[PDB]
């Protein structure tokens, strides 16, 4: 089943070190880029596209 946090919106969090991360967009069923400020945010926040795809897009 899909973890519920996969359905949270992208959350850029706080901080000054901007960094690209990947999030699952539940409406589009796609793993997309977003800008993460380095701190805070939520669990729908992945280092690599494959992480998002295996965890949220095509979950075990």
Report how far residue 34's alpha carbon sits from residue 48's, in angstroms, rounded to the nearest whole number: 12
Neighbours of 60 (CB within 10 A): 6
How far from the centroid of its chain's Cα atoms is residue 27's Cα?
13
Method of determination is X-ray
Q: Which residue has the tokens 């380095």?
A: 38
Asked whether the beta carbons of 41 and 11 are under 8 A apart, the reply is yes
Number of separate domains in the chain: 1
Q: Which domain holds residue 31?
A: 1-60
What's 23-35 look like in SS3?
A: EEECCCCEEEEEE
Q: What 3-state DSSP class applies to 20?
A: strand
């Amino acid at each position: 089943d899909r973890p519920s946090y996969c359905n949270l919106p992208a959350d850029s969090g706080s901080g000054t070190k901007s960094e690209q991360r990947i999030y699952y967009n539940s409406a589009r069923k796609q793993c997309l880029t977003f800008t993460y400020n380095g701190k805070g945010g939520n669990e729908n926040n992945f280092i690599h596209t494959y992480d998002c795809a295996r965890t949220c897009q095509y979950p075990a």
